[PDB]
Design a protein around this ligand. Structure first.
Ligand code: 168
Ligand code: 168
Lengths: 392, 392, 392, 392
């Protein structure tokens, strides 16, 4: 008699490149589009939504509770509720776990959950109430400070990726080959229409003409191992991690519509899948990229699943270094991992990422008839999140 | 049977005045102290915490996931997890209901949940990626923009208070008499030592000497009706809402340690209460101060309680206009509400506030042997949140 | 026996467009090239220079006394002196008058005087010592605030141009025809090589390569009356003044090397002319564009010249409106004025402008054998400056 | 006969401490008050002024040509002119010399010349036109960058002071003794009323009551040798220069009214003195504090005076180390130098400083009946300025 919560529908924007397609688009506008889309896709009216839960890491200057702004712009009435949350990179997936819990505790019926992020729109900042009596001071890039800098050891996420490259003795070649394989899988899938279903177009409004954005613009077409092998290391001069074998800075949103299984049945909805389990676990901040290991093992143990049971896997590629380490420790078939590419190619809109890869997982699970699935993400400050999805 | 989760223990910092005692104290530092406090108070080792969940509305510049920074500074091991969330003024109490949900769904055994806020340390910000080829630009106060300003209508929270005052025909006098009652109640509680149990002293580390802060410094000593009636309207030149009958800008943190009833009994812990229900509902952002009315009613319905069963209430005083209005609608005995004073006196450290009033309720329920209690707050953008607590 | 001071030599950079050729070139670097050039042109060694005097309105952030920075870079000895000055648009010409005065009172023999300006490099700023306790504040564009905004009435110099347009009843048609004539005369002069003599090339050092700039890049080629006529008014929605009939925002330096007539004779130098007189007079800030009227009249009377004695004139074009009013009042033959075009086409690097038009005057006087010349500028805050030059 | 220019009258504000009395008072406000005062003291109407010349190193953000704002505020007519200039610390005295040249060349009859500075109001800046697509950037303190940092060697003026200390082998003790004597002489002069004649009171207007400032607030009362000796070196860790034996960061204005000797006689004015000579000379930037040596010597030679002919001297105290060096080299009787204290005590409002000390000299010469005086200052970037004054 345990609660069975399903994902009735999902959708994501395309992922924009840094200061690219969505250079001037507030996170909450991207969120509103995905919210309306999951509702239209499921045939559910906005007024039936109890609450919107949206992960977002970089809200500075966007005003009160951007999740609420997203919900209200999507047409979800004032009666519903909304809130944001921040488990950094895990945010978008975690939000789905959290939404599932609202329904499992009988506190709601229909949740919209996911994530949203405008890294482009993130401001610079300084604390100036006390004044600066004399001397220079720093205007601080909130994207870097609040999104990409380890709070404990003081270094960029890319150095934690170097720490993983040295513990696992991963060569520069092994990482450059992984990223080339990710770009090529993503270019293949995009041209074959495999992102069409999950992507809802977004209308960037302008003065000299609106623009429809429905293609992931951060993917690199014709990615040779040459353009990878010619890059300098970005975080250590005798290291292996580069702009080419790391993910980038990106804008996007993504969302899922959750309700009980019996509810989806009552509404004539064919659900994208059932949430069987989730799990988050901590690891050393220094090697934060390993997060997916204990989070996925725990998720799998809560499902009563073996690693071999899995038919599909979205394992977020923040860095090639961390991804290979995860694929090695866990030891699943790499041919079913990031089957349509991953974040090195597609982008990593921090708060949105977890709901982005969940989209890719669900829609590709429909495409090929995979029964069991698992999405998982490493997290700055040292954590992982994971979720097991079973098709119906 | 049903899960049953208890608040094993609770603690909060004093609430500091704006650019006051905590002027230069990062939110997570305040948060850390209160995490160590709830652990110590319950007799639980930090190594036993599965997850720290902390409300926070104004984290700009503090770096990656300040809940994880509070958790680590407090000595919760890297293996645990941590996140922040934002349901604005409701964040601190919502984090507690979220934590309870973690335990009810079987995903955790032991949560620290609460909130934290340094409104003092909130930076001014500006989006400057595109560059500013010519012309003045605004450095935006994130405290005002992201905390205090309604996103839909463009005006401060105090203006929603004017809308509520007007709806309910609340005179200036009546708002002012409420504010004085609240100050006089709070100065009394302070003097008679009724804040001591709940407060854990925070030590401010400076160059010139450590300062231990263990007293709410926002409370005005010897407040009079005469003093209030001298003040000018702060939001409307023929309005009723002043600085004297509105809460303030404040710094502080507050948390609670949650576990199952059965686990408290295993550990010999005598908990502060059982979380019997909670609820959140939405309303017109224009009159967000009415949030607590449907929130408290839904919460009481979920608990199976009538309003007269309540023995003690903490209904947050964002503004006298809204506080009076909520009290007149629900009809609870004003004498069991904010019995040691409310936020006009004590302060409103946004993200911490909901855990702040929860602390006050729990320790006063204990000291007078109350059995049934409710905490509730209005939420900017048009929401309310409430929680019902029963003593063991 | 009244002292006679000559201009032995002169030089100017090309005038750069706003954030264009000299986008990242500090004013002092442009100044240094022009100091070296006037020395080279006169056959005078840097070791012989007593003082360098440079007009400069927007030095913020450039460091201590950019005039000294310029002169040291050009190898003027540490035993010499250097200072900057600021009479706004008048500065580069006032500098020369002041340098002439050093020699006249016997305090110096050899002066390099002019001005320099990098409007591109001008920063944004805020008084932040006292703090901003709460609320937004402005980051102020120093170029606009200290350069282009009237300090009394608070509006841009364009509005003073509107005031002049109304008071002199100057049509949009007349102003635009003037603007097009300036563009077309400057393009002709450019293509014929008439700026070559005065322009010294400036090498913009980069990383991917050095670029030699020796063309005035703000000059529009093939400028049409239609392109002027289609612009909207820039300062008053029912006005006549536009971006097209106003000058621009620009970068440049320019200078003159001064000595007594007898010293030039001793050296065998053929000077560019003798400074027979100068003057500066104030007018109403509201119609500051009129400055050249009383200044030119005073300069001429000090020279004992009638207006009809002039063979050539450089009257600076801050705005078509004021250029037209000045020509109307003075009544000098427009065909002898801004013969090679003016600032509408060439640009207006504020602190340099006055020495820029002096350069154009002097080299045209030489080229055509004009005997008597005058340069004059209008000045924000309501002033004018004029200088009479006679050929030797 | 030669042109003889006299100082008819003089006045200065008190010198305010950094973020002290004048923390929020724009320099031009201070200037306006001293302009009005020199007019009143001379019995000359504002309508009679031809030009205002005001030294000012740090005008960023104050708007167009603060000299003109100052002159207009004092009711100097729109028909007059005004300009600012910058020879750093020498500026306030150089303006006077420049003012004298306007009259000697017959270009003006009546000049108000001096300087003004608000180091408190100096802003922080950043060049932001190109944008900062990613990363932290610096907000630069303009007071330090444009006022106090050497542009060639990149270090503060205090480092130049160390270089002079080492070269002249000046002990810590000798420097501190000098500093203590400056404080103690200034304090005696203050108590005895010796600054009253030269100071014009300034009214600081504020919402909560006007404050009249007529005392130099930087002067330390009861300054002890021990208070100096305890300090740590501020620039070199085995240096000798400290906050105590250097001057401060200060706000002030000061000026003089000039006219020919014959015009003063026509008007029946008894002048404060005749300007007999002035000089400016350069020195190595690295030892800029030595500027007063070649400059004083040149001024004296130009006057036909031996050093021993001087009855009184104001040699500016940028730093004890340099003031000591200057006095050692010149060898004048130290008992006639800075007779009422100097800038270590009184403060150093850069652009005003040279006119400030001139005020002190003039009024002491008058009060004790000294016939021959000299004022002189060192100048960052390696210069000196000096002026010889004789009583009539
Ligand atoms: C005083 C002087 O420098 O002479 C005239 C200077 N003219 C200008 O600076 C106008 C340049 N204008 C432009 O580039 C566009 O018309 C503008 C609308 C972008 C300018 O914007 C403004 O309104 C200013 C006055 C703030 C520059
Ligand atoms: C030429 C000149 O500058 O005159 C002397 C004025 N004094 C100063 O510039 C130094 C003022 N110094 C101080 O208040 C303290 O020494 C300080 C160490 C706190 C200043 O901090 C600094 O390092 C600088 C940049 C101001 C020198």
């Amino acid at each position: 008699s345990t609660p069975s919560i399903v994902i009735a529908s999902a959708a994501r924007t395309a992922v924009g490149s840094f200061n690219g397609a969505f250079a001037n688009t507030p996170a909450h506008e991207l969120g509103a589009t995905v919210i309306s889309a999951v509702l239209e896709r499921a045939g559910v009216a906005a007024g039936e939504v109890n609450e919107v839960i949206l992960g977002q890491v970089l809200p500075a200057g966007e005003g009160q509770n951007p999740a609420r702004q997203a919900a209200m712009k999507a047409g979800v009435p004032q009666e519903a509720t909304a809130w944001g949350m921040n488990q950094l990179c895990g945010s978008g997936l975690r939000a789905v776990a959290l939404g599932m819990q609202q329904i499992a505790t009988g506190d709601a019926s229909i949740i919209v959950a996911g994530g949203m992020e405008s890294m482009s729109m993130a401001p610079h900042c300084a604390h100036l109430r006390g004044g600066v009596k004399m001397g220079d001071f720093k205007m601080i890039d909130t994207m870097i400070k609040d999104g990409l800098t380890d709070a404990f050891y003081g270094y960029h996420m890319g150095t934690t990726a170097e720490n993983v490259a040295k513990q696992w003795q991963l060569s520069r070649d092994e990482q450059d080959a992984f990223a080339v394989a990710s770009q090529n899988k993503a270019e293949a899938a995009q041209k074959d229409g495999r992102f069409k279903d999950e992507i809802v177009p977004f209308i960037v409004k302008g003065r000299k003409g609106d623009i429809t954005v429905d293609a992931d613009e951060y993917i690199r077409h014709g990615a040779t191992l040459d353009s990878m092998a010619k890059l300098r290391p970005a975080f250590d001069k005798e290291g292996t991690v580069t702009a080419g074998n790391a993910s980038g800075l990106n804008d996007g949103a993504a969302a899922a519509l959750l309700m009980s299984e019996a509810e989806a049945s009552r509404r004539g909805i064919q659900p994208l899948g059932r949430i069987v389990s989730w799990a988050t676990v901590g690891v050393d901040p220094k090697v934060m990229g390993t997060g997916p290991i204990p989070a996925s093992r725990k998720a799998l143990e809560r499902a009563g699943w073996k690693i071999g049971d899995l038919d599909l896997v979205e394992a977020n590629e923040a860095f090639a270094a961390q991804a290979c380490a995860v694929n090695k420790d866990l030891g699943w078939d790499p041919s079913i991992v990031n089957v349509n590419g991953g974040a090195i190619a597609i982008g990593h809109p921090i708060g949105a990422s977890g709901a982005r890869i969940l989209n890719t997982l669900l829609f590709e699970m429909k495409r090929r008839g995979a029964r069991k699935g698992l999405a998982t993400l490493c997290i700055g400050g040292g954590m992982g999140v994971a979720m097991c999805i079973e098709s119906l």
